[PDB]
Coordinates of C-alpha atoms in Angstrom, one line a residue:
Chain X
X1 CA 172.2 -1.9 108.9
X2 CA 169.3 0.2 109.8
X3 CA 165.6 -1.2 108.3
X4 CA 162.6 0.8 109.5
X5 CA 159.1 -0.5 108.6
X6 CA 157.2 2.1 106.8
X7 CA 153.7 3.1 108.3
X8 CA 150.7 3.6 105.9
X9 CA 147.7 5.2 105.6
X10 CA 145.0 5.0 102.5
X11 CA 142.8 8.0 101.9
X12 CA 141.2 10.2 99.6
X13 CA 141.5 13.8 98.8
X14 CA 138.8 15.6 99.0
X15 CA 135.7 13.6 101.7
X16 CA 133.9 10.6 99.8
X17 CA 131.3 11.3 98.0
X18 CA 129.5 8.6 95.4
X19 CA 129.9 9.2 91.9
X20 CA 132.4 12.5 92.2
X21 CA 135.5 12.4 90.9
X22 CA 138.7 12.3 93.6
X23 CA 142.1 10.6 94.3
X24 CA 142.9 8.0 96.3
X25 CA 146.3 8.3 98.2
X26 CA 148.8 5.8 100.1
X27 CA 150.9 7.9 101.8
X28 CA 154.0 5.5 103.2
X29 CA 156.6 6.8 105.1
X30 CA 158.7 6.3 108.2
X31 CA 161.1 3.5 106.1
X32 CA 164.1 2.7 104.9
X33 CA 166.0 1.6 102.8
X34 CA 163.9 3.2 100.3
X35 CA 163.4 -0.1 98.2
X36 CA 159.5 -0.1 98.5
X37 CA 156.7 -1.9 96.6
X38 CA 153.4 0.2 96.6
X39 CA 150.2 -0.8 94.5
X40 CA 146.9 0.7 94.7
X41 CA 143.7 -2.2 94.1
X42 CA 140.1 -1.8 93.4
X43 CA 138.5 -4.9 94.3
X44 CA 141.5 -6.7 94.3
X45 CA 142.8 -5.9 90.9
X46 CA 146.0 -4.1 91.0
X47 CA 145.4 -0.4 89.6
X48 CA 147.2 1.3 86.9
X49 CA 148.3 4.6 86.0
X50 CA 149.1 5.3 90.1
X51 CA 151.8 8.1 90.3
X52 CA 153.8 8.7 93.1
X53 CA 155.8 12.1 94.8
X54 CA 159.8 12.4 94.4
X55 CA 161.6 10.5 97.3
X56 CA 162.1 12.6 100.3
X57 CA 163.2 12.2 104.1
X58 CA 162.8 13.2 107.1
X59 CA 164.5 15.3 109.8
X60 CA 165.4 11.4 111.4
X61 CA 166.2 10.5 107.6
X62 CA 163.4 7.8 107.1
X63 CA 161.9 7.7 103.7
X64 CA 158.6 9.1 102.6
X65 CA 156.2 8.6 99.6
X66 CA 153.3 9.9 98.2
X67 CA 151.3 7.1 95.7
X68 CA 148.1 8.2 94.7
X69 CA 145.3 7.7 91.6
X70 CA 142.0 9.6 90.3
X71 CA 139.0 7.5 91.6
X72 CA 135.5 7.7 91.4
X73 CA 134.2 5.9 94.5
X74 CA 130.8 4.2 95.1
X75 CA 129.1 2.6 97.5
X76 CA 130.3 -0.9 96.7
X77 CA 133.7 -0.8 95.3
X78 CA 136.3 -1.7 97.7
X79 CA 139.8 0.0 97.8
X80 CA 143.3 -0.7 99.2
X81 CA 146.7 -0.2 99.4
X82 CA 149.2 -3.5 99.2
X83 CA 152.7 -2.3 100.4
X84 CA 155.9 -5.0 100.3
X85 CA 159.6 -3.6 102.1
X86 CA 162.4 -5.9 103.4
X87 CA 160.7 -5.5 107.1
X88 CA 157.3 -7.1 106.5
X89 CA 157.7 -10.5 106.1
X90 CA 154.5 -10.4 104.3
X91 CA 153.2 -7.3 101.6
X92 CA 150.8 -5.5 104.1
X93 CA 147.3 -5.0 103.2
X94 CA 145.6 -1.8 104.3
X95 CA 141.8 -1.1 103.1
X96 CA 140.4 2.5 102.5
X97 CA 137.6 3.2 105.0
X98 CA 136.6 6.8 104.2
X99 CA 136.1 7.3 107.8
X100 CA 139.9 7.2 108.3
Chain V
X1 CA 169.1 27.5 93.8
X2 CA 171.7 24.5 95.2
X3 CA 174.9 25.6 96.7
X4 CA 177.8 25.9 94.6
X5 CA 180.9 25.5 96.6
X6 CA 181.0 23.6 100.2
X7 CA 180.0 20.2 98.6
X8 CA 182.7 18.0 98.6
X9 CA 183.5 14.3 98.9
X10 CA 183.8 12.7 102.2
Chain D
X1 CA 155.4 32.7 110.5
X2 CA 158.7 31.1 110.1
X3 CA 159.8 29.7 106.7
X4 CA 162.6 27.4 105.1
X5 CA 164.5 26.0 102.0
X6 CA 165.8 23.1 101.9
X7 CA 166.9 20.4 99.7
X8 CA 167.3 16.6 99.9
X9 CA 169.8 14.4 98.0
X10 CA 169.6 10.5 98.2
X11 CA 172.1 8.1 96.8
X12 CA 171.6 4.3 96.3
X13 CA 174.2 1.8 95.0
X14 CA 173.0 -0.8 92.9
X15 CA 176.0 -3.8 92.8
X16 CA 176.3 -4.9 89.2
X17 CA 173.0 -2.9 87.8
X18 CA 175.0 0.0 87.0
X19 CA 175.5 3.9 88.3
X20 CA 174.1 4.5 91.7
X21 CA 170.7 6.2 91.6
X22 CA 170.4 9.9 92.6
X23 CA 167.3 11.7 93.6
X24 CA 167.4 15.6 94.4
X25 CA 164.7 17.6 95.5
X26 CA 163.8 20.8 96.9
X27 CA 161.6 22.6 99.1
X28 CA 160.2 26.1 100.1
X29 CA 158.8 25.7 103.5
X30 CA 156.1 22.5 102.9
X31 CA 155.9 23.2 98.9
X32 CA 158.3 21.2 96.7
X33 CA 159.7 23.1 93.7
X34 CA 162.4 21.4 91.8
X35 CA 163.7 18.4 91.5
X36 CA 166.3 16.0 89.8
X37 CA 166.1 11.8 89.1
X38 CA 168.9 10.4 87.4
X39 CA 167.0 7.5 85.9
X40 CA 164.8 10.0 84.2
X41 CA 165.2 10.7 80.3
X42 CA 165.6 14.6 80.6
X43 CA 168.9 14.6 82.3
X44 CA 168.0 18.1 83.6
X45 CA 166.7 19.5 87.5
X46 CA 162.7 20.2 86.5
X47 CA 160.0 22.6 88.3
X48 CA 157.8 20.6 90.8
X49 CA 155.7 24.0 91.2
X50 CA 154.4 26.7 88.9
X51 CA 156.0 29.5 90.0
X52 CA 159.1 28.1 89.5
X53 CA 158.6 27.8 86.2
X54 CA 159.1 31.4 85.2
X55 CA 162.4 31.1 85.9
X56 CA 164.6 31.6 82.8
X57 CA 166.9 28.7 80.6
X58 CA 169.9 30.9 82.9
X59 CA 168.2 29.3 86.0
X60 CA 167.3 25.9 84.9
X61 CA 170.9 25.5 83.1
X62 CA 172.6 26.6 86.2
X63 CA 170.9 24.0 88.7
X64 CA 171.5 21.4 86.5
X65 CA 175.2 21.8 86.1
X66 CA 175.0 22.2 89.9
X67 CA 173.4 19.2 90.3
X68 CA 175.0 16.8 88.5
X69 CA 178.3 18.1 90.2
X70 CA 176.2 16.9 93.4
X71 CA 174.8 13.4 91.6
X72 CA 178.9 12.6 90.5
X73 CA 180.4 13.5 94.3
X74 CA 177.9 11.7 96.1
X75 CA 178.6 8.6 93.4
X76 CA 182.8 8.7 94.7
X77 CA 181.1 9.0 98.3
X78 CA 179.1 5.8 98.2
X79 CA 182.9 4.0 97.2
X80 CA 185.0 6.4 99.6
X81 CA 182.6 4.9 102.3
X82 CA 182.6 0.8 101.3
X83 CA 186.5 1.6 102.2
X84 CA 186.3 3.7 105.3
X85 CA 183.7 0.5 106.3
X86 CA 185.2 -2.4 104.9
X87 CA 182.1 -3.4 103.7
X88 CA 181.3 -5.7 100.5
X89 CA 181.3 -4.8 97.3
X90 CA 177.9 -6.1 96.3
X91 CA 175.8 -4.7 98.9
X92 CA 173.5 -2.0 98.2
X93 CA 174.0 1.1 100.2
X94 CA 172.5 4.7 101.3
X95 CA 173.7 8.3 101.4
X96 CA 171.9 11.3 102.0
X97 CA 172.3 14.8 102.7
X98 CA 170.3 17.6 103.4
X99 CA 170.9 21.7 103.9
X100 CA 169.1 24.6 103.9
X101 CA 168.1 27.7 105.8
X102 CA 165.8 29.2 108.0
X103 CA 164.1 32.4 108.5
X104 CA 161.7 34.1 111.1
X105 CA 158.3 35.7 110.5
X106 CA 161.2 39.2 109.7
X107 CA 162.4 36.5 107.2
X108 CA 165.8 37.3 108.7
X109 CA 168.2 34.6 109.1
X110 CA 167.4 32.0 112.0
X111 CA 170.0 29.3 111.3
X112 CA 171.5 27.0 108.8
X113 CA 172.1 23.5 108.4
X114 CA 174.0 20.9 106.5
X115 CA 174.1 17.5 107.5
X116 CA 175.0 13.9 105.9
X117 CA 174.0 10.3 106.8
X118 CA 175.3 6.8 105.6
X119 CA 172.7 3.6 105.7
X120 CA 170.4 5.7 107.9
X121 CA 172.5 6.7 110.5
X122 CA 173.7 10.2 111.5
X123 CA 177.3 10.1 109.2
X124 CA 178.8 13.8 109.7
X125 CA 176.5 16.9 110.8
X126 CA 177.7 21.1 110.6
X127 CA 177.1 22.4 114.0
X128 CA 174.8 25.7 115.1
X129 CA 177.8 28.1 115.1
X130 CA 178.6 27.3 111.1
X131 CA 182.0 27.3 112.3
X132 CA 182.1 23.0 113.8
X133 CA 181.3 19.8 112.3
X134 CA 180.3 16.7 114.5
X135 CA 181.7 13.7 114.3
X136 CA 180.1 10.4 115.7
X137 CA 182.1 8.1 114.5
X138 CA 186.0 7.3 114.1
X139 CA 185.1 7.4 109.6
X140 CA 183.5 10.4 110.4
X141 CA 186.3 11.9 112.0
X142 CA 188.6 11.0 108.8
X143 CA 185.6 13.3 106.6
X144 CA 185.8 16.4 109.5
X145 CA 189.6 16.4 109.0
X146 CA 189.6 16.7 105.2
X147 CA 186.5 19.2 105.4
X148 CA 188.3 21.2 108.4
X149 CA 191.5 21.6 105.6
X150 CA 189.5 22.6 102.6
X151 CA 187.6 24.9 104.8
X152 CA 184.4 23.9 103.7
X153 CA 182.3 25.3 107.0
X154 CA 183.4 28.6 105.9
X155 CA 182.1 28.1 102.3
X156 CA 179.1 26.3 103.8
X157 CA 178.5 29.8 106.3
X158 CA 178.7 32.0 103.4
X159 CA 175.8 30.0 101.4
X160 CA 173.6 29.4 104.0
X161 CA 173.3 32.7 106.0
X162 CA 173.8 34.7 102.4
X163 CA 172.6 32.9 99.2
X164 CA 170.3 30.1 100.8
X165 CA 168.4 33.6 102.5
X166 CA 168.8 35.6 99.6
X167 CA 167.0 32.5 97.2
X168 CA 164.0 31.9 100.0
X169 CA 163.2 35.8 100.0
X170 CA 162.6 35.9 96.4
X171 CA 161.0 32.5 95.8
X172 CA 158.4 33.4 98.3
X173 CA 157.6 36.9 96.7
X174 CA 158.1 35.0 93.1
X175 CA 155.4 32.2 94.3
X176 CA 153.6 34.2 96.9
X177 CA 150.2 33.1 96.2
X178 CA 151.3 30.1 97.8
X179 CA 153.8 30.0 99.7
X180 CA 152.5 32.9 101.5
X181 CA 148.9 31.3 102.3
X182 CA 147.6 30.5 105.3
X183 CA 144.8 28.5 104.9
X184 CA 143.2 27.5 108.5
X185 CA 141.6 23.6 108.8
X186 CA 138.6 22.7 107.9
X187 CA 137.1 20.7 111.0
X188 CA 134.2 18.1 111.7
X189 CA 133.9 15.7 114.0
X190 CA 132.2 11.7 113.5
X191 CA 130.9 9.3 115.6
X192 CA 130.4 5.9 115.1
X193 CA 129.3 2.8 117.6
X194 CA 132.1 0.2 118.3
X195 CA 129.6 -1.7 120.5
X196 CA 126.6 -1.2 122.9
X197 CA 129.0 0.7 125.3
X198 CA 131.5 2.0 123.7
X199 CA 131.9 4.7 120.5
X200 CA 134.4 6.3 118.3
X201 CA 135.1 10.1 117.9
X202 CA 137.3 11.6 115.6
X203 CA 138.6 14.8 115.0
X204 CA 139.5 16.4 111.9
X205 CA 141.6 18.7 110.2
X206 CA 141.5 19.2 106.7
X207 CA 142.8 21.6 103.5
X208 CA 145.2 23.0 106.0
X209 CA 149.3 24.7 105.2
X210 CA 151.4 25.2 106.5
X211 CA 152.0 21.4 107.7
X212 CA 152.3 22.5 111.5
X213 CA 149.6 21.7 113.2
X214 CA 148.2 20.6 117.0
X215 CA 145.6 18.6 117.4
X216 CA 144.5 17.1 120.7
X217 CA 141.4 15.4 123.0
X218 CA 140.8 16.4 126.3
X219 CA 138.3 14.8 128.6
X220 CA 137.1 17.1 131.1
X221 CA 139.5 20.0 130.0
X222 CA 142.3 17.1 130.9
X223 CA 145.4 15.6 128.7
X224 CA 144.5 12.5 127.2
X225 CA 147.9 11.8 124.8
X226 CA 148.0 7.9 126.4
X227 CA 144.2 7.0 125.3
X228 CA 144.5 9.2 121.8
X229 CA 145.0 7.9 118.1
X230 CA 146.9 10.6 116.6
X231 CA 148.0 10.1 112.7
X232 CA 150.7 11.8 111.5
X233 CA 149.9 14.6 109.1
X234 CA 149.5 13.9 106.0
X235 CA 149.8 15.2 102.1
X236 CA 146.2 16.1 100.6
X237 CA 147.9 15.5 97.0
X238 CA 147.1 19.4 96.1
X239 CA 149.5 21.5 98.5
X240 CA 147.5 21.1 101.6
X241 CA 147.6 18.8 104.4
X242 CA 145.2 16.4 106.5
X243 CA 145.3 15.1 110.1
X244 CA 142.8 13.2 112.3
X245 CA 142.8 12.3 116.1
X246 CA 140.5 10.1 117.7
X247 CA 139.4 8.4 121.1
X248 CA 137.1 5.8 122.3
X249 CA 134.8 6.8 124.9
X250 CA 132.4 5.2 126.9
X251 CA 128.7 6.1 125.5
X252 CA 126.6 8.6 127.2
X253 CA 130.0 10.3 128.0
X254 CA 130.3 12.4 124.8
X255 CA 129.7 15.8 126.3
X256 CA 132.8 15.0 128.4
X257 CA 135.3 15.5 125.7
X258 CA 136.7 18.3 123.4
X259 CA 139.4 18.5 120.3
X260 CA 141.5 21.1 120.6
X261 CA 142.7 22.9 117.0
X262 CA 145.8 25.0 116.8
X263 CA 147.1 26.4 113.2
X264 CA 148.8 29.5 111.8
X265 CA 145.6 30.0 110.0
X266 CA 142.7 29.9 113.3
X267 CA 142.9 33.2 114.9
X268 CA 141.8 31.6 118.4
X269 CA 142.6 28.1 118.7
X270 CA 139.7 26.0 118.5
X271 CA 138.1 24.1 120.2
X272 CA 135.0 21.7 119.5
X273 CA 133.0 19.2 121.5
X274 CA 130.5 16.5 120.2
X275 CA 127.0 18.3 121.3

């Protein structure tokens, strides 16, 4: 019974710029089963409207997922991806720095 | 276009 | 300049919530296309890319009697396997398959593929030749038996090396505008202090496809794969792809190392050096 943890990063499309339109992307991959929890906040407040890619695999067959939302960022809103799967024992918490 | 023949049951 | 179709097919039993679900998608090269979700309203495969789209009601009607044959076999597989196991009945579980073709920069045939896992694990696999299946496991072996007798390598061959090639060559002339693109990365480097002693550098590579990419940091012209943070590349959201590799170096040692930058799209590798 195979259970690989996904890995995650938290990004945006284009670089960061304040007050320009962009997206915001969680891109989780690496996991399976494909049973995954993935929810984009802004200052702690679970966002809406986030759409995610059709479920693929890779050439090892682990899972991979594109979530991702149209943001606006500035210089004091803080973003992050929350991501829950049967091999954290705890939803994992990764913030966007727009240096990564 | 998805294969049409080859894709049977195990 | 090498490309590839392929398509993905997951299947996931859910005990006493009804049929299992079924996800199909497709792929030219990096570039989804189509794809198919049997919890979705519209019953039907739909375009993932626009020039897909011009494909007539012929084409669309045709995949999605196709793949609903595929949805309904891989439901009896998910069952067939339970048995083969003797596993419980209210346990969710996973199938997947995957097949396609490549090509070479000729966009002649390369090879072909077709291979199917259960919970994750390599299940049954066509070999190289087109012609062999293996086997790693004693359930496995009862599937190559039945799929030896209903000659399904041979119908498999016929596919792969003829119609799978014969599809890719006219999507990619259909869609050429972007499947045959080579857009090289856009790089920069930053720099930012961890301490009094020590600082960050990071290379990147971004707006890049194909996918492929190397990216590397050398100190003094010497591998540094141990002491680098290398992401794995990653999906821009509009068709192109980002990656970044960083190091931590000791300050007043910047000049000491370079990125390295190879793509389809850079003539000459690059190479760039904090200065």
């Amino acid at each position: 019974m195979i259970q690989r943890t996904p890995k995650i990063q938290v990004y945006s499309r284009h670089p960061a710029e304040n007050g320009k339109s962009n997206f915001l992307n969680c891109y989780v991959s690496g996991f399976h089963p494909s049973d995954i929890e993935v929810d984009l906040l802004k200052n702690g407040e679970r966002i809406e409207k986030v759409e995610h890619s059709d479920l693929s695999f890779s050439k090892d067959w682990s899972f991979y997922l594109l979530y991702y939302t149209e943001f606006t960022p500035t210089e004091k809103d803080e973003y992050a991806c929350r991501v829950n799967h049967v091999t954290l024992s705890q939803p994992k918490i990764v913030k966007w720095d727009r240096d990564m | 276009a998805l294969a049409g023949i080859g894709i049977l049951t195990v | 300049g090498s490309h590839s179709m392929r398509y993905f097919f997951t299947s996931v039993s859910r005990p006493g919530r009804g049929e299992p679900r079924f996800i199909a998608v497709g792929y030219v090269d990096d570039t989804q296309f189509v794809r198919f979700d049997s919890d979705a309203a519209s019953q039907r495969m739909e375009p993932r890319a626009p020039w897909i789209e011009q494909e007539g009601p012929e084409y669309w009607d045709g995949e999605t009697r196709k793949v609903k044959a595929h949805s309904q076999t891989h439901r009896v597989d998910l069952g067939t396997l339970r048995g083969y196991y003797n596993q419980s009945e209210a346990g969710s579980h996973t199938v997947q398959r995957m097949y396609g073709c490549d090509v070479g920069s000729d966009w002649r045939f390369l090879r072909g593929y077709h291979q199917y896992a259960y919970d994750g694990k390599d299940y049954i696999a066509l070999k190289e030749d087109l012609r062999s299946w293996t086997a790693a496991d004693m359930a496995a072996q009862t599937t190559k038996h039945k799929w030896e007798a209903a000659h399904v390598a041979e119908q498999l061959r016929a596919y792969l090396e003829g119609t799978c090639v014969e599809w890719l060559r006219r999507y990619l002339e259909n869609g050429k505008e972007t499947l045959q693109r080579t857009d090289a990365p856009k790089t920069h480097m930053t720099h930012h202090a961890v301490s009094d002693h020590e600082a960050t550098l990071r290379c990147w590579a971004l707006s890049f496809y194909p996918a492929e990419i190397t990216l590397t940091w050398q100190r003094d012209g010497e591998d540094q794969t141990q002491d680098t943070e290398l992401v794995e590349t990653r999906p821009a959201g509009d068709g192109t792809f980002q990656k970044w590799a960083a190091v931590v170096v000791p300050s007043g040692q910047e000049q000491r190392y370079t990125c390295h930058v190879q793509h389809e799209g850079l003539p000459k590798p690059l190479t760039l050096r904090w200065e």
